[PDB]
Structure formats: structure tokens, C-alpha cells
Amino acid sequence: TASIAQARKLVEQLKMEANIDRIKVSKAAADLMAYCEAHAKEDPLLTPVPASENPFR
Amino acid sequence: AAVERSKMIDRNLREDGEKARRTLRLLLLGADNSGKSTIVKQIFETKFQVDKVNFHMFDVGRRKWIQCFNDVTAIIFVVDSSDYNRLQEALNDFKSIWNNRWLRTISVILFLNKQDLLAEKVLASKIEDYFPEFARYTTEDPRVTRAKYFIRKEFVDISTASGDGRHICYPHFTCAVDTENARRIFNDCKDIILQMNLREYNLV
Amino acid sequence: SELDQLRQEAEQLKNQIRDARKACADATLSQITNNIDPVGRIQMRTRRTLRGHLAKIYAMHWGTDSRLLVSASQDGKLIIWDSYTTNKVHAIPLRSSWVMTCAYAPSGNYVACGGLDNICSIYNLKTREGNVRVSRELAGHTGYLSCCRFLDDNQIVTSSGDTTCALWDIETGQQTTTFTGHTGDVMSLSLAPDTRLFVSGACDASAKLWDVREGMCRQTFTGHESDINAICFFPNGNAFATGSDDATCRLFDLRADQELMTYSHDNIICGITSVSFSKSGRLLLAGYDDFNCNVWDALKADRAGVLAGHDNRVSCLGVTDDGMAVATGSWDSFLKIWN
Amino acid sequence: DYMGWMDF
Amino acid sequence: EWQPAVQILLYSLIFLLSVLGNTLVITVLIRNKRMRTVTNIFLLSLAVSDLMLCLFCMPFNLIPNLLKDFIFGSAVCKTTTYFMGTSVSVSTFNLVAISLERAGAICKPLQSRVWQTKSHALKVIAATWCLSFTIMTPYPIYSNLVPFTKNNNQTANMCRFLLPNDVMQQSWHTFLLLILFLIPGIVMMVAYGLISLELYQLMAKKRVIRMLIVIVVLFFLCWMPIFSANAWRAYDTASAERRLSGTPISFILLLSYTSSCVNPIIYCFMNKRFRLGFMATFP
């Protein structure tokens, strides 16, 4: 009867997964995009810094 | 003072690699009731010595972690030849190992253990009931020799269907009382290194 | 009849999940990011080469200060590097040479290492005797360890090949919480920036979101075709990226609960070994089996650069907390600092 | 007759 | 003037082919780090030494024969003689080193793992180069122009190398005939014979054994005539100079120079791995 208990466990897992709230993928993608342009200026990899600031010459 | 510390550390690592380079590393593979631990009389590991050459054998107590052993000298693969029910599983496992993406250049030393049990079973016959193609096979007891050669051929056909000469299989028939397995491994590793040298020195 | 009813209920629940995700999917990340300008070619160049390892490198981790880093190699040595001057600060001899992961404590006082020994070993870097010593050996996993990350000086999360993740209390040396639900071996791990959640990737092509305090699985993602090898949170903490043997990368969103974007090209046929994000999060850096490292525009999926220069498989990868430099390890036995 | 050569 | 026509034609042929081959080998070996093994270090050494031999021997050895006069200065005479001797010594010792490395790797594959390393190869290359530079010291000392007048009352010279006495001249030439021809020849024959014996005791194995035979045959045919002629001159200069002056010694020198032409061909251009590297490097 262990297989029955396992199947009940997956049933509960999928019930919990269905009970979660979700937001529109358009809004989520807009949020990640907005984060990216918000913190773009602080990223040295997408825009190299001059050798005066670069610690690795 | 820091750079001196770094240089001392680097000297220590160089001296460590010097000692590490002198051992040949071997991967032990096989299923249950194969008899892996009995092969050599001397992540588990074991060590033994033949003719001033150091061998260090490893067997993990399989797909993902096999990548760690893509640089060993040889893979030692053990198969139980006493019974025929598991022989198809052993052949499939051997094919999976031989055709592995990360093991394409590693030779396999094949051990077919409990040949005494196989001889007893044959002389005292059901192998045809598991392999219909064993019927009318040809080339100690002649029937036992026929069965041994049939099983060895079954492994060697898989071993030769692919490989392109990058690596080859070395089948052996061994028993529990056979103590020559270390010497066989030593000779096989000598052959593997010789074949590597022929390519690496532009001779072949 | 109970088992059949449970199976039918599971199928109905999975169909409802799929329908909820389909209703959620009103637009595509590629359509949203159509108007943004591309980053252009990412011309990164090697700046340091860290020599001293005499075998394949499997793992590296940056320190909280962007100077020090630790790397693990199957020569049996764990080396702490001063990346500014390439000096070797420490060289830790390991009890087992088959290691596969390494972590550097956020405080800087400890490092962790593990592999085919089914043990996570903690090393004290700030002892009073001047040498490095083991603090505790965390035993209890039944498979090999594939990733580990410190939460603090006393809390560390590990993933294992035994399909389970664990949370540890280092002082006691016992598992505080066990995480279960994966069916394939867990290969990667990534703590959230707020350290309240983490995601893991498994060989069953699935990614799960876990709750550290509760110990329960929140979400499950299954877009990949083959085993997932690498995982890493987006800097915002609301998304993550995975790399698979199927030779693709996917970006998922936690609040959207589904795939957002895939990073693939027809020429690439090898699997991804490691992934990481930059400071801004717009660049996604992935290591491949083709000996190269490719830079992906995580918002546009366009390939922006290549970190060529390694002569063997790129096993590891890591970006600094400041975002100044990237370190890549390889089976060539050399680590390289880029940009 | 510029006889002889250089050794090599 | 058919004989001079053939002489300069062949000089140009072997010169161009050896230069191009050595340059290609040097470029491929220096570019593909993957193609950097113990034997490949010695191959690069041999390519550099063959280029040195070609450049410092062949153009300076046809002129004094065509114009019967040494036109260059004493500095050029001394430098060219030193470089020719150095290149010959380095080439011969690199060949012996390659033969010994191969013999060890094929005869004791596991025992030779201890010492067949890149650092050991670097030690060997450095020792060979330094030993050659040290031993070839007397040539820039005793190389000087000997003047003579021609029938047209014109000036002329003979860059030449003469020790103060004929006895020590003979000793020097015997020492060269030993160390640059005889001992290396016996060592290479023994090494490749052992390699062939071990490898034989299949169509590919016969090919590689015949290649090992070709190596020794080419070495002996290329280097026997010139050393024999030098020994003949040391023992009785008059007869040797009368017989071999002009085209015969020029052609013997060309036969000697052909070793630098053939060595890249046998050692690299017949290797599949190398050919692949060349195709990957050049368009």
C-alpha cells in the first residue's frame, strides 16, 4: 500500500502547486527588463571601465 | 614575503605532482555477484604493486559520475559467467560503457569470472535456452570450450563493432583461485601505453 | 481502485497546471524585449592565468571580496588565490581527490568541499596556529555531492546525487531539513540573494523551488529535454537560468511559474556545463563542452561573445560580487580571469 | 685552380 | 656548361624546398599548443637546425665554386663556418635524441614514464645546443682567407680551416668523423633495429618498419661521402684536392644538404595528425 501513499503524496504536491498564485508573463518580463535597465550602469562587463579603475589591468 | 610564500607553495605542488604522476589509475566496474573485490589479492580504493609500477584501483560504491574517470589508464570490467539470466544485462551494461561519450579513448580489460562455475554448469547446458544462436556454434572439455568462446565472442563483437582503433578490449577468463590477474592487468596496461606511444611519437 | 483514482487525479491536476500556465502565457519575453537595443559584441580578454593545478578543475567560487577565490582540482588540492597578484594564499590538501564542488563562506572564515566521498568538509581559514584545519565533516548523504553553498558560518545547503538536498547546522553536524521530490540526481544549486529560497536542477530535466524555513517544494519547472547541469538565480531573485546536456539554456520566472526564453543555436550541439549572471543580469555566461564560453544576451537570447582560450572542457564559471571579473576553470588545469 | 673546399 | 646548369638548378630546388618545409613545420609546431609533445619539441629543434644549416651552408658553398673565389670577408668566412659546424652537430644530435626517445618509449613504455617529460626534453635540447656551440669553437678561430693569383692577374681567396700542424689537423678530422658520423650512426641503427624488432614481434607495421629503414638509409647516404672526403683530404690532401675539386665536392655537399630537405618530409609531412594541423592552420 506504499504506492498508494506515494500517489497521494504526488496528489498533494500537485494540489499545492495549483494553489499558488501567478502573475502575467508580460508583467514578469517587464519587471526583469526594468531591473536590467535600472542596474545597467553599474555592470562593468557590458561596458568596460577604463584601465584606471580596472583592478586587473 | 607573500610572493616567497606563494613560491614555496608552488614548489610543494610541483613536488606533489611529481609523485602523483608515477601511479597508474584504474576504474573498477561490475555488477553484484561479479566478484570485483576478489580480482586482485591486494568511493572505495585499493593499491597494489607489480614490477616497481604502482597501480591505484577505484570503485564507486553511474552515468553522471563516470566523467571523473575519463583519464584513467584502463577500465576493469567484471562479468559473472556462471549464470545466463544476467548475461544479457551484463552485455547491455558493457555496450553502454564501451559506447560512452567520455570513455571513447579508454581501453577496457574484460574479466569473465567464475569460469569454474561455468564449466561445472556446462558439463553437468541451458545456455542454448537463453541464446538460441548458440546452436551449432564451433570454435579441456570441447563443450565447455565452445561455451567459453561463445560468451567471449559475444563480448568481443560488441567491443569490435565500434572503436576505430582508439581503444580495444582485452578479454580474460579467471577464477577465484587465479592470482595472475595483477600480472594480466600489468601486461594489458603495458600494451595500452605502448599503443598510445606509437601514436604520440609519430611512429604510427 | 484507490491507486487508479489517485493517478487520474494526478493527471487532472497536471492538466489544470498546464491550462493555468497557458492562460498565464499572454505574451513572450522576446516580444517584450524587441525594442531594446542589443549589447553588441562582448570583447572580453584574458587578464590573469592561475597555474599550479596539475589535473582537471571541477569547481571554483569567488569570495565575498572580489579578490580571493577558491578552486578545486582532482589532484587532491584546494587552492585559495589572490586574483590581483596571482599569489597562492593557501593550499589545502584534501583527504579525497574526487571532489566536484567548492564553496567560500560569505564571512571569509571557512571554505567547503565535496565530491564522490558523500561528505561536505568545512575548513577553517582563520585558526590561531597559522594552518588550515577541518572544522566538521557533514555526513549523511547517500550519493555524491554536486553543489554546496554557505548561508552563514553555521548554515550550509548541499545537493547530492541521491535526489535530495539538505540543510545543515555546522556546529551540531546534523541535517536540519531534508528536501525531496526530484526523481533524477541533483546536479546544481543556487541560493537566492535574500537566502530565503533556493533552486536546484536535476538529471530528470526538472527545476524545483524550495523554501528554506518550511522545507517544502514551492514550484516545479520541466521545460528542458535532458539532464540539467547548472542553475543560477537572476540578481533580482525572481528568476533563474539552467543549462542542460540538450545544449540549450532556459530562463524561468518564479512569479510566472513557466519558461520565458531559450538560448540555443544550430551550431552548438554540446551540453552546457556552467551558467552565471552578470551584475546587471542582462548578460548570461555559459560554459560548454566545445571548449568555449559563450555570452548570451539574457533579454534577447542573441549570442554576444565568446571566451575562447581554454584547451579542454570548461567545467566551472563564476562572476565577482562587484561584477568586475569572470573566472573560468577547465580540464586544461588552468583558471582564467576575464575583463 | 682554387683547389679544395670548406669542410662542411 | 651543362654541369653548372644542373648544379645551380639542384641547389635552387633543394634550397627552396627545404626552406619552405622548415618554415611550415616551425609555424605549425609553434602555433598548435596541442601538437606540443616530447617528440614534437625535438622536431621543432630539428626544423630550426635544418633551416640554420640550409641558410648558412648552401648559398655560401656554391659561390666559391662557381666563381672559384671567396668574395666575402674574414668575418663572414668565420661566422659561416661556425654556423655550418654548429647546425650539422645540432641536427645529428637531435636525430640521435629522437631515435633514443622513440626507442625508450617503445621498449619500456611504463619504465620510461618516470623520465620522458617536457622538462627532460628541454634539458636535452639545451645540453645539445650548448655542447654544439662549445665543440665547434676552433672554426671561427682558424677560418681565414688564403690568397692566390689567377691567370688574369686577378685577386682570389680560399676560406679554409687549417690547424697549425697536419697531425692535429688529422686528429680534428678523425674526431669529427667519429662523433658526427660513426657513433651517431651506430646508435641510430641499434635504436631503430630494436624498435623494429619489438614492433614486429600488420600491413601498417611493415610500412613503419620500412620507414625506420629509410631513415637510416637516408642518413648514411647523405653523410658518408662528405666525411669520407674530409678524412681523405686529412690523410693526403694533394690527391683528394686534385680529384674532388669543383663539381664533385659541390655535388657531395649537396647530397649532404639533402638531409635537411628530407628530415621534415619523413618526420612531419607523412603524419596524419601533422597534415591535419597544417590544414587547420593554413587556408
Q: Which three cell numbers stand for residue E249?
A: 665536392
Q: Which three cell numbers stand for residue C71?
A: 578552486
Q: Which three cell numbers stand for residue C212?
A: 528554506
CB C303 within 8 A of CB C265: yes
Cα–Cα nearest to B193, from B107, B110, B104, B98: B107
The Cα angle at residue E85 between residues E79 and E87, in degrees rounded to 5:
95
Subunits with 3+ Cβ pairs within 8 Å of C are A, B
Residues sharing a CB contact under 8 Å with residue E251, sequence separation 6 or more, in sequence order:
E7
Residue of chain A whose alpha carbon sits nearest to that of C261? A29
Question: What is the b/e burial string over B58-74, where b = at least 16 CB atoms within 10 angstroms of the residue's CB?
Answer: bbbeeebbbbbbbebbb
DSSP C131: S
Instruction: For chain E, list the domains and their CATH numbers.
Output: 2-281 (1.20.1070.10)
| CATH for B1-201, options being 3.40.50.300, 1.20.120.1760, 3.40.190.10, 3.60.150.10 | 3.40.50.300
Helix (H, G, I), strand (E, B) or coil at C148: strand
| Residue C239 with chain A: CB contacts under 8 Å | 28, 32
Distance to chain A for C262, nearest Cα, Å:
14
Instruction: For chain A, list the domains and their CATH numbers.
Output: 3-53 (4.10.260.10)
Rg (CA), chain C: 20
CB B175 within 8 A of CB B33: no
Is A39 in Cβ contact with C29 (below 8 Å)?
no
CB C110 within 8 A of CB C124: yes
DSSP C301: -
Distance to chain C for B106, nearest Cα, Å:
17
Phi/psi of residue C325, nearest 5 degrees: -140, 155
Q: How far apart are CA A37 and CA A34, in angstroms?
A: 5
Q: C222 CB near a chain A CB, below 8 Å?
A: no
- A–C: how many Cβ contacts below 8 A? 151
| Residue A42 with chain C: CB contacts under 8 Å | 279-280, 323
Give me the sheet containing C133-139, strands edge to edge: C99-104, C110-115, C119-124, C133-139
Q: How far apart are CA C268 and CA C287, in angstroms?
A: 12
| Residue E273 with chain B: CB contacts under 8 Å | 199, 202
Phi/psi of residue E102, nearest 5 degrees: -60, -45
Resolution (A): 2.6
Is E242 in Cβ contact with D6 (below 8 Å)?
no
* Technique that determined the structure: cryo-EM
Longest dimension (CA), chain A: 70
Cα–Cα nearest to C208, from C226, C194, C195, C190: C190
Residue of chain C whose alpha carbon sits nearest to that of B14? C52
C-alpha count within 13 angstroms, C-beta hemisphere, residue E78: 9
CB C297 within 8 A of CB C38: yes
Domain boundaries, chain C: 1-338
Residues sharing a CB contact under 8 Å with residue E184, sequence separation 6 or more, in sequence order:
E92, E93, E95, E96
Is D4 in Cβ contact with E237 (below 8 Å)?
yes
In terms of C-beta density within 10 A (0-12 exposed, 13-18 middle, 19 or more buried), how is residue B41 classed?
A: exposed
Q: Which three cell numbers stand for residue E259?
A: 638531409
Superfamily of domain C1-338: YVTN repeat-like/Quinoprotein amine dehydrogenase (2.130.10.10)
Q: How far apart are CA C251 and CA C286, in angstroms?
A: 13
Residue in the block written with cell 586587473: A56
- Distance from the first to the final alpha carbon of chain D: 20
Q: A43 CB near a chain C CB, below 8 Å?
A: yes
CB B35 within 8 A of CB B42: no
Chains D and C touch (3+ CB pairs under 8 A): no
Q: A30 CB near a chain C CB, below 8 Å?
A: yes
Residues sharing a CB contact under 8 Å with residue E60, sequence separation 6 or more, in sequence order:
D6, E72, E76, E80, E84
Q: A36 CB near a chain C CB, below 8 Å?
A: yes
Q: Which among B183, B201, B204 is the top mutation candidate for probing chain E, defined by the most E β-carbons within 10 Å of its own β-carbon?
A: B201
Helix (H, G, I), strand (E, B) or coil at C154: coil
